């Protein structure tokens, strides 16, 4: 239509004296036209045009004002000294009428940056509360843009934003709730308060419902303090308003992840909610679906089926038919697959071009995804090869072949062989590469390789370089794997085809010379089956889904080992007792992502305990350095050393340790409590993940106590015969004490309490005791730190409560004393 240069240029007159609202407005229209028609502005002339226009803001005409808003936003980024236009926009923005109000806030806020943010706020507060949708919605979207430049200004607007939220007017609410969710967010909980306020309400605003559904879709039970249900009384889990999109979004989330469970007037576990909307017009597309559903997509699938299946079969309209395939695909599942496959077979008949490729891929893809047997997948993959013969590709040769060598290989090659009979050189580089690669790699004894070779030999002549090169190298590997083959390799390679073309020659000269001339140490080594060049995943199935309706390694296996590894890096802990075990009951001192996350584990050594404290400073305003967790033992333990966490910045874990020595004569338990306080140096930080200030202050954060149990000292085992082990460990360290467990009225619980506490597995599966028997003998075994066995015998008497005489024997005085004390 227009020329960008002439129009950008003539705009410069505004900058001088002429303001002429008609002429300038036209010139502006022309700018909008240059963009719209599709053109790109030249920067010098743009920069000039922008400074000129600001003069035009003096004249207040509604059409000129309008031109001015669109033109400055489009020209804003390809212009300089734009800042002048802010004042003019504020002047316009306060002027009453929707033409100015709404369009200005949007143009102003786009140009506005954090410095300028402050200016627009009075006018913004006035514009947001409006139940006149233009002014309010433009102001609400405007605030969203402004969250970037400066967050804090926008946040103050949360009250005006909320005020708009209370409208049932669709725009004012959609914008209000949507924006609010973004704005007020400083934690989940404050947003959740905003949502609960609207939540109990039966809106007539579908957009608000939708934007909110998304916020809601996850279970929120902290909305406005707390509440006893994930409840959403606005359609998400409810079905207060029917309208097929909202109904679909809501129904797929709620069914197997309740936003609330099913109500008689609002299904929300049952499959129903989608289905009542399901017979419909074009509208049906949302309605008919599924996704998730109780307990599977399949009972759901049956409802809707009439609709999806008739459109999919009948309509050879692309627009309908696509909705019908997506809808079939959605009502699908593992079960559904029988049905889904016949339909997809049928579908290509309506739209057959790419759609053909897709159905032959889909039937294979569905068989791989939803199991109807891996074999059937191969058989479908043959049908794909047959029908298209060329829309298979290179990625198919690699994917078919890799997939095939899971089971199919002998068959696949053979099928391929037959498939190769097709068409000599229009079959493509890829099929020849597949029969060639497979015949090379399997080295057929399932069928005679001679047919395969004869088929491939012809294809090579008239097809691309990459296959002819493929054919020589394959032949060489084929030689190395099977001796028999060598005579065919020679007739093929001497030919002008499989060698002596171009690329084919170079590869061949190498491959040939290595087979012919050389040892074939290399050739032998090279064939490991004669496999592909790469093993990807199973690419086809996802591709197909969209297209149709258009080494974790480990050391440790035990808590002691993983901790032992962590400990081992540090010297002191392995140098001063080596680790018998680490706790089977590690206790987290301070909860996750509050102030600190500290998890401590107590590790036992031959004569020591090391406490590993994994410390996180989740303090947004700080970053920590030289952090240690300090300890006060409540019994006689010596605290030898502290190992610091070098730094703990915001949200970054670090580990600190305290090594203490264990008593080895203590008459009371090694079940003991340590009071923990982390001390550290704080340097100020701007929350990101870390950043330290030039100077800072000392600060401390209090932590929970760490409890060490007898369970940490002992590792559980059972014995085949307790009595022998029990005598064998040391009846010379034997001590006996009688306890009453009055809070345990039966033997079975009693055995469980001694077993858990001590960290001893009761022998011979003695946690199950004959219910309410007068006498019982409980056999305990486990190994104590240092590597010495500890056996405990508890002879239980059951009155109405449990009394036990617990006799313990151990290779030391300490386990005996420790167990006896801890139990009572």
């Amino acid at each position: 239509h227009l020329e960008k240069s002439a129009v950008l240029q003539e705009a410069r007159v505004f900058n001088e004296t002429p303001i002429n609202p008609r002429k300038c407005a036209h010139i502006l229209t022309k700018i909008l036209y240059l963009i719209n028609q599709g053109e790109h502005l030249g920067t010098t002339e743009a920069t000039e045009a922008f400074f000129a226009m600001t003069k035009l803001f003096q004249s207040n005409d509604p059409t000129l004002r309008r031109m001015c808003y669109l033109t400055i936003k489009e020209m804003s980024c390809i212009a300089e000294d734009v800042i002048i236009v802010t004042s003019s926009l504020t002047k316009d923005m306060t002027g009453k009428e929707d033409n100015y109000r709404g369009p200005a806030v949007r143009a102003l806020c786009q140009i506005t940056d954090s410095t300028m943010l402050q200016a627009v706020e009075r006018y913004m507060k006035q514009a947001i509360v409006d139940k006149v949708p233009s002014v309010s919605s433009s102001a609400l979207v405007s605030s969203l843009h402004l969250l970037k430049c400066s967050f804090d200004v926008v946040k103050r607007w949360v009250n005006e934003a909320q005020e708009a939220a209370s409208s049932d007017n669709i725009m004012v609410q959609y914008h209000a709730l949507g924006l609010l969710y973004h704005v007020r967010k400083n934690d989940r909980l404050a947003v959740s308060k905003m949502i609960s306020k609207f939540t109990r309400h039966g809106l007539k605003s579908p957009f608000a419902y939708c934007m909110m559904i998304r916020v809601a879709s996850k279970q929120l039970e902290e909305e406005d303090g707390s509440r006893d249900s994930p409840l959403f009384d606005f359609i998400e889990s409810c079905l207060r308003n029917k309208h097929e999109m909202v109904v679909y979004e809501a129904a797929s989330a709620i069914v197997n992840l309740p936003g609330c469970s099913a109500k008689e007037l609002a299904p929300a576990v049952s499959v129903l909610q989608l289905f009542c909307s399901s017979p419909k017009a074009a509208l049906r597309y949302a309605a008919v679906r599924t996704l998730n559903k109780v307990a599977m997509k399949h009972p759901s699938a049956v409802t809707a089926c009439n609709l999806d299946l008739e459109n999919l079969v009948t309509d050879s309209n692309r627009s309908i038919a696509t909705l019908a395939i997506t809808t079939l695909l959605k009502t699908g599942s593992e079960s559904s697959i029988d049905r889904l496959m016949k339909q997809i077979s049928s579908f290509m008949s309506e739209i057959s071009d790419e759609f053909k490729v897709v159905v032959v891929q889909a039937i294979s893809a569905l068989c791989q995804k939803y199991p109807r047997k891996h074999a059937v997948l191969m058989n479908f993959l043959f049908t794909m090869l047959r029908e298209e013969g060329g829309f298979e590709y290179k990625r198919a040769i690699v994917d078919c072949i890799i997939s095939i060598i899971e089971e199919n290989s002998e068959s696949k090659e053979t099928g391929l062989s037959h498939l190769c009979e097709f068409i000599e050189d229009c079959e493509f580089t890829v099929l020849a590469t597949r029969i060639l690669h497979l015949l090379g790699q399997e080295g057929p004894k399932t069928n005679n390789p001679s047919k395969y070779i004869r088929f491939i030999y012809n294809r090579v002549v008239l097809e691309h370089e990459e296959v002819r090169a493929g054919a020589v190298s394959a032949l060489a590997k084929f030689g190395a794997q099977n001796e028999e083959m060598l005579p065919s390799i020679l007739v093929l390679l001497k030919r002008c085809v499989m060698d002596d073309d171009n690329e084919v020659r170079d590869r061949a000269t190498f491959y040939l010379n290595v087979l012919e001339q050389k040892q074939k140490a290399l050739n032998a080594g090279y064939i490991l089956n004669g496999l592909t060049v790469s093993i990807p995943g199973l690419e086809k199935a996802l591709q197909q889904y969209t297209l149709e309706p258009s080494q974790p390694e480990k050391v440790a296996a035990t808590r002691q080992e993983i901790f032992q590894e962590q400990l081992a890096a540090v010297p002191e802990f392995q140098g001063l007792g080596p680790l018998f075990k680490s706790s089977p009951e590690p206790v987290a001192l301070t909860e996750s992502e509050t102030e600190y996350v500290i998890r401590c584990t107590k590790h036992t050594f031959s004569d020591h305990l090391v406490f590993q404290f994994d410390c996180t400073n989740t303090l947004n305003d700080q970053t920590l350095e030289n952090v240690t967790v300090q300890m006060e033992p409540t019994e006689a333990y010596e605290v030898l050393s502290y190992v610091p966490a070098r730094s703990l910045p915001y949200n970054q874990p670090g580990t600190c340790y305290t090594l203490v020595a264990l008593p080895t004569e203590d008459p009371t338990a090694v079940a003991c409590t340590f009071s923990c306080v982390m001390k550290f140096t704080v340097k100020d930080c701007d929350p990101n993940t870390g950043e330290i200030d030039e100077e800072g202050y000392e600060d401390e954060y209090v932590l929970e106590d760490l409890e060490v149990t007898v369970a940490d000292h002992i590792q559980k085992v059972m014995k085949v015969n307790f009595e022998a082990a029990w005598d064998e460990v040391g009846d010379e360290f034997e001590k006996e004490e009688t306890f009453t467990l009055s809070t345990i009225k039966t033997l079975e619980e009693a055995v469980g309490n001694i077993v858990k506490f001590l960290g001893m597995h009761p022998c011979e599966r003695s946690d199950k005791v004959p219910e309410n028997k007068n006498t019982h003998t409980l056999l305990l075994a486990g190994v104590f730190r240092g590597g010495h066995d500890i056996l405990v015998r508890s002879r239980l008497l059951l009155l109405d409560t449990v009394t036990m005489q617990v006799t313990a024997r151990s290779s030391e005085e300490l386990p005996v004393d420790i167990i006896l004390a801890s139990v009572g």
Binding site: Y33, G38, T63, G102, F207, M245, A282, R318
Partner: protein
């Protein structure tokens, strides 16, 4: 805050009489036109309120020599999108003082540009009331 991906009003080839991009995904002419040609090819010569293109529900209508578009998300349905598309058709008609054809749009290029910006704002649906848009805009 997002519903509408883009709005296009296209001649009966898919070429840009108009498009205004409420996505940031097409700003350059080459690609804005490619998009336009892409959506017009699927959707056209099968009029319904549904089309699925690019994994997005595309809602469209037609006139004498134009096809009118809203592209939006496919987690929705036609009807939500349709409310935008109906506003788009309607508001342009009342605004221009003549029904949407290539002739009405070209007749008043300014009414068309302004009217569409009121309907969609950066992919959020700013307005959907045809009457409101028309008063809001000044020719």
């Amino acid at each position: 805050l997002y519903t509408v991906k883009a709005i296009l009003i296209l001649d009966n080839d898919g070429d840009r009489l108009f498009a205004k991009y409420y996505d940031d995904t097409y700003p350059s002419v080459k690609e804005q036109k490619a998009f336009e040609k892409n959506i017009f090819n699927k959707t056209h010569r099968t009029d319904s309120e549904i089309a699925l293109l690019e994994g997005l529900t595309v809602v469209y209508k037609s006139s004498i020599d134009l096809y009118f578009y809203v592209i939006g998300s496919s987690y929705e349905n036609e009807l939500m999108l349709m409310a935008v598309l109906n506003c788009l058709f309607d508001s342009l008609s009342q605004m221009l003082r003549k029904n949407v054809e290539k002739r009405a749009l070209l007749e008043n290029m300014e009414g068309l540009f302004l009217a569409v910006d009121e309907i969609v704002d950066g992919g959020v649906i700013l307005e959907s009331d045809p009457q409101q848009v028309v008063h809001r805009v000044a020719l």
